[PDB]
Each structure stands twice: as C-alpha cells, then as structure tokens.
C-alpha cells in the first residue's frame, strides 16, 4: 500500500525508499518534480516542545535612532494633526518631518537636545505644521 506514518520522515524519504524496495511500482508525479526542485528544508515531523529554564527566543526586536527621536516628539506634542494613513505607500506624517529636521540639524554639529528639538520645531513652524504643545 504505502507508509502512512506522518512522523517517521519527510514524504521524500518515505516515497523514495518505498519505491526503492519495489513495493510501490508506480512513481508519482510530485516525486519527480520534487527531485527537480528540492525545497529549503525537508518537511520532516517535529515535536512542538515548549521552552524551559533560561532558554529564550532568538528574535531581535526592531528599533532605530529615529524612534529615539519620535519618542520625544510624541512625549511633547502627541500624535500628529495629519492623522495617519497606512493606505498610502510613501506617506510621511508630522513625526517624519520632525525626524528629518532633527537629522539635518544633527549633521549641523549641535550636540544639545533642546537646541535640536526646538530649532527643528521652528523648522517645522516654517513648513506649516501645527505643533499643539501638550503639557
């Protein structure tokens, strides 16, 4: 008949060696195509064991220095008056304007926080955005 054991190995293994003994006398289609283009990993059964002890994930949380600025933008003024759209691919809000004003003020050689912040804030008061200034 065949091998219905889901655990034992990848379908490639089961099939290939099944044929190999002469039990299955008809090669399936998918076996030949699979010989042509093997996928990244062999689909072998693995047991979803939970982690114990000091073992933690390998994920790297995602952060940039831009965010270290956006943190202070939000800290002062709040979310931008332009609202947001995740529909528009290239969209950039008030916060992005603030980030790039602060970047171009950073290459200017000002190491101080208040200078960069307030002068990128006037740099924004020039372009026509309204910074509410929440307490």
Partner 1 sequence: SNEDLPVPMENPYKEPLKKCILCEKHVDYKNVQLLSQFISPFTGCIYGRHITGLCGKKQKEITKAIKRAQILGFMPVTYKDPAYLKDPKVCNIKYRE
Partner 2 sequence: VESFASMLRHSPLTQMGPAKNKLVIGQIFHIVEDDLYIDFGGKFHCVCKRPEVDGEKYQKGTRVRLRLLDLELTSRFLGATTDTTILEADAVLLGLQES
Partner 3 sequence: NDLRDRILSEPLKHADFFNLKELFSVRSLFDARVHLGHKAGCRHRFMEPYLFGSRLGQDIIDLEQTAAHLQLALNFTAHVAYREGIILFVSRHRQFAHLIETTARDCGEYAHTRYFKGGLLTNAPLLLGPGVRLPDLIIFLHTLNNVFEPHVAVRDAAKMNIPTVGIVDTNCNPALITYPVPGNDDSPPAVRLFCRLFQVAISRAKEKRRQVEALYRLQG
List residues near partner 1 by CB under 8 A. 60-65, 67-68, 70-71, 74
Q: Are 82 and 93 in contact (CB under 8 A)?
A: yes
What Rg value do the Cα atoms of the chain yield, rounded?
29
111 binds, among partner 2, partner 1, partner 3, none (CB under 5 to 8 A by kind): none
Burial class (CB in 10 A: 0-12, 13-18, 19+), 63: exposed
Q: Which residues bind partner 2 (CB under 8 A)?
A: 50, 62, 64, 66-67, 70-71, 74, 78-93, 95-96, 99
What would the two tokens of residue 29 be?
């289609």
Distance CA 2, CA 94 (A): 63
Q: How far is the CB of 112 from partner 2 (least distance, A)?
A: 24
Distance CA 3, CA 9 (A): 10
Strand, helix or coil for residue 50: coil
Q: How far is the CB of 105 from partner 1 (least distance, A)?
A: 18
Strand, helix or coil for residue 97: helix
- Applying CB under 8 A, the site for partner 3 has a residue count of 33
What would the two tokens of residue 36 be?
């042509």
Which residues from 25-44 bind partner 3, rule CB under 8 A? 28-30, 32-34, 36-37, 39-40, 43-44
Q: How far is the CB of 59 from partner 2 (least distance, A)?
A: 15
11 binds, among partner 1, partner 2, partner 3, none (CB under 5 to 8 A by kind): partner 3
Which residue from 20, 21, 26, 51 is in contact with partner 3, where contact means CB under 8 A? 51
């Amino acid at each position: 008949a065949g091998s219905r054991l889901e655990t034992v190995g990848s379908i490639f293994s089961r099939t290939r060696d099944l044929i190999r003994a002469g039990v299955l006398k008809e090669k399936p289609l998918w076996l030949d195509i699979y010989n042509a283009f093997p996928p990244l990993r062999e689909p072998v059964f693995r047991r979803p064991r939970l982690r114990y002890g000091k073992a933690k994930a390998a994920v790297q949380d995602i952060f940039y220095h831009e965010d270290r600025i956006r943190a202070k933008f939000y800290s002062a003024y709040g979310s931008g008056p332009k609202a947001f759209d995740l529909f528009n691919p290239n969209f950039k809000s008030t916060c992005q304007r603030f980030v790039e004003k602060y970047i171009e003020l950073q290459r200017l050689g000002e190491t101080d926080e208040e200078k960069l912040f307030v002068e990128a804030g006037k740099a924004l008061l020039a372009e026509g955005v309204t910074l509410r200034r929440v307490g």
